[PDB]
């Protein structure tokens, strides 16, 4: 029962420190790429995130090796997943390209060293100023998400006398029109492509789709890819062209729970279900029914960085609350542990019911043998971590003390830009472990002077 | 059914421009305190929030008037609701005090002009550095939320040789142990107070509670206040002391849907359900069963600023999507309108299923007669506004065009500090309408340079 959950969770804890490519233990402390995380959290003020460049490289290798059966594959990291400049730099130095989701993301990618021919710009709202900036910078692709936005691409490319390179985003009906804001209908692809061919400064490269995020099955990718391949094949015949590419988007899942033998990915997508190899096998099998020479573009986000960070947060308070009966005798006790990170720091734990493994990094070799509830510091009754090991309860060593460092694993995707300054708690610093195992700060914690510098006031 | 929902929504629209103390129309445009909001959105880049100092002043009056039967009432604005400096300054100018929820909130309240004796510091995690800053600045109250924290208050007040003024937060059990992280158990209040009396530099002023947010009935306040009052009375007798105060927290709701004849506040807490007068009557009646002279502290947040801002966002794209059967016949059309604000700008619309009235501010006098779906700009399938007029559908004029300005009303509570830079879209500017009806920018939109300046990297060559 609960004893079996505790035994299972401690087997997973032992696997973290005795088999996991990312982690070790030393002096009783969790280590990441040889870096003692208790020690690291004494150097830098908690809470903060620490990223591993080695793990980013491993994730990228998994993705690229998955596509070995198709040589002409181009990989664009979805920078909305994490765009801290040192993280983008690690990804650039690992040899892949970048996908951007706003004018400022395009600019960041250019400023960290991605060339224009290494950038894809996606979005449902690309205003004229956004489009002008992208076209002026010779981006590899600007997707086309609506007919309205295409009229601006035609007009602006003519004004600049510069070619805009596009893919037409189609969303296959695998309710789409009522639940999917993005893309054109499949029915609209032929006429849209026809008109693009006639535009003097717009070049049509191919079609685009994106299935979703943390997808726990391969069938959605296979079916959606087939829709895109069949339409690509047909339009090549109808229009008398050969497409440069097909862009199949992202959505390769990451394991957030590892004990797959106990999990159902279609009911709980914290279990990853498929691997990068499964995603590639499905995509390539469909593309190769049409062409083996065509370029396949992919836009993985979560898979590049998700497993490659840990959130380190200090236990900063504790209390016991007790439910009493009618005679004043104890019914049960609840042990609350408060950490210095809440949902303003780790937003998806609250807003998207996201699970992350939690361990006492200061006592990582000790049995996690006590049921606790884990709270954040925000003055808000809802700011505690509800996605526990058993219901809303977590497991930590009974020896846990204030001052210990708690780690949340798999904290590298969609965790930095989603932070807030609610309660005027600062957004976190971020540390990078580089390929040599050395650490450096890559984002400062917001200072007080940051809290008010955006405001205009006299004091 | 749907036709009557449409009729009702347009009745609500006419009430905004006819009988709402905040709004008017001019040239077919929504106006706020006489400021044309279509025009304002041509001066400042969208999306942005606009606050009304007159409406904050009105809300503060409603709260203060509600407590007229208890002269010794102190009102502390819960600054976690909105701490833009110009907003805090307006609240200080209106004559009330401030509640703070972190060290930086305390610091900004002091830097905008609140005296230490006008500030309450609350929290479940007050680290030694936070407590030292608070004690050094002679705050009116620091709540005591745990026995662990109390040990630090004793040690730090001793180090500074400065009295720390405290209230003991109790969570009335009205499952509390499993679901309420804040406060002590009632059963722990007596010994905690006993310890405090013996500490040389800690001064016990009373007990504290906070019921919750957007509470749509008076009974929870009455029941919880009675628990706190009963224990206050008992501890005066046991300990032989006279408390200075009781702090009953916040929770006054704001109307987010106005047609109370069509709503049940107990099933849909977007309907307010009670007024500030009902809150005061409930609290005061319970306190006066104990003492009529003791000071009552209240900590309203949402009610101070909620109705006092509008989010202005430009329609930036449009498309029609069509579902076909397997033989190419139309099943339905969906008209999508895309605005330049998404959940990174208006977080509670997504994360807390919060409803805000949506109108076309550029066509405020035109019938809102077309069902549409309203999407944001984030490259994320879930970034569209789900809390519609009917299910996930909203109503806008059929002739809505790209370039029109959409207003979300009642956007003044918990909407600024909760923004993010997801997708590297900037957090928004904020405009203030002062008492004379004039406008000024009080918060800039994040620039590209602001956004990259937190990062440490070598500029590529
Ligand atoms: C990002 N897609 C979003 C991710 C939302 C996270 N909260 C979605 O809703 O699907 C995206 C990606 C990367 O997706 P990944 O799941 O991180 O691999 C790739 N291409 C596009 C166009 C895209 O919007
Ligand atoms: C605020 N309490 C939070 C508000 C979070 C909403 N997202 C809660 O969950 O209850 C608070 C207040 C002001 O509450 P109001 O509802 O805005 O009036 C007052 N005192 C305390 C201690 C407090 O946490
Ligand atoms: Cl590549
Ligand atoms: Cl003494
Ligand atoms: Na710390
Ligand atoms: Na062309
Ligand atoms: Na004392």
Swiss-Prot record, chain A:
Gene3D superfamilies: Alanine racemase, Lyase, Ornithine Decarboxylase, Chain A, domain 1. This is D-ornithine/D-lysine decarboxylase. Homodimer. The modification N6-(pyridoxal phosphate)lysine is found at residue 80. Pyridoxal 5'-phosphate binds at residues 251, 299-302, 414. Keywords: Decarboxylase, Lyase, Pyridoxal phosphate. The gene is dokD. GO terms for biological process: lysine biosynthetic process via diaminopimelate. PANTHER family: DIAMINOPIMELATE DECARBOXYLASE, GROUP IV DECARBOXYLASE. The keyword Lyase applies. GO terms for molecular function: diaminopimelate decarboxylase activity. The keyword Lipid biosynthesis does not apply.
């Amino acid at each position: 029962m609960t004893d079996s959950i505790m035994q299972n969770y401690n087997q997973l804890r032992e696997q973290v420190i005795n088999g996991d490519r990312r982690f070790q233990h030393k002096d009783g402390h969790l280590c990441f790429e040889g870096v003692d995380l208790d020690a690291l959290a004494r150097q830098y003020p908690t809470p903060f995130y620490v990223f591993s460049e080695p793990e980013i490289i491993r994730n990228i290798h998994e993705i690229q090796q998955a596509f070995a059966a198709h040589k002409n594959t181009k990989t664009f990291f979805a920078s909305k997943t994490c765009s801290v400049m040192g993280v983008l730099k690690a990804i650039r130095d690992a040899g892949i390209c970048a996908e951007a989701n706003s004018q400022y993301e395009v600019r960041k990618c250019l400023e960290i060293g991605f060339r224009g021919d290494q950038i894809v710009f996606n979005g449902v709202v690309k205003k004229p100023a956004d489009l002008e900036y992208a076209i002026a910078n010779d981006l590899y692709l600007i997707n086309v998400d609506s007919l309205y936005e295409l009229e601006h691409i035609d007009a602006i490319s003519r004004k600049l006398k510069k070619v805009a390179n596009v893919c037409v985003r189609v969303e296959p009906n695998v309710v789409t029109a009522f639940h999917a804001k993005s893309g054109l209908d499949l029915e609209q692809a032929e006429e849209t492509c026809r008109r693009i061919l006639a535009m003097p400064y717009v070049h049509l490269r191919g079609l685009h789709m994106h299935v979703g995020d943390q997808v726990p099955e391969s069938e959605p990718f296979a079916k959606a890819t087939k829709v895109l391949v069949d339409e690509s094949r047909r339009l090549e015949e109808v229009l008398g062209i050969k497409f440069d590419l097909i862009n199949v988007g992202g959505g390769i899942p990451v394991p957030y729970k590892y004990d797959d033998e106990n999990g159902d990915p279609l009911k709980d997508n914290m279990y990853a279900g498929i691997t990068a190899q499964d995603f590639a096998d499905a995509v390539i099998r469909e593309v190769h029914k049409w062409r083996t020479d065509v370029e396949i573009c992919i836009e993985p986000g979560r898979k590049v960085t998700g497993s490659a960070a840990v959130l380190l947060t200090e236990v900063s308070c504790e209390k016991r609350k007790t439910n009493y009966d009618l005679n004043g005798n104890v019914e049960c006790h609840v042990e609350w542990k408060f950490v210095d990170a809440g949902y303003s720091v780790l937003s998806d734990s609250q807003h998207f019911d996201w699970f992350f493994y939690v361990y006492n990094a200061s006592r990582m070799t000790a049995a996690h043998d006590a049921w606790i509830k884990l709270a954040g510091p925000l003055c808000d009754g809802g700011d505690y971590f509800h996605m526990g090991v058993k219901g809303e309860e977590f497991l930590l060593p009974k020896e846990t003390h204030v001052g210990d460092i708690v780690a949340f694993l798999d904290a590298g995707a969609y965790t930095i830009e989603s932070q807030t300054v609610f309660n005027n708690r600062p957004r976190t610093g971020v540390v990078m472990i580089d390929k040599n195992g050395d650490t450096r700060l890559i984002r400062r914690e917001d200072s007080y002077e940051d809290m008010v510098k955006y405001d205009i006031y006299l004091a």
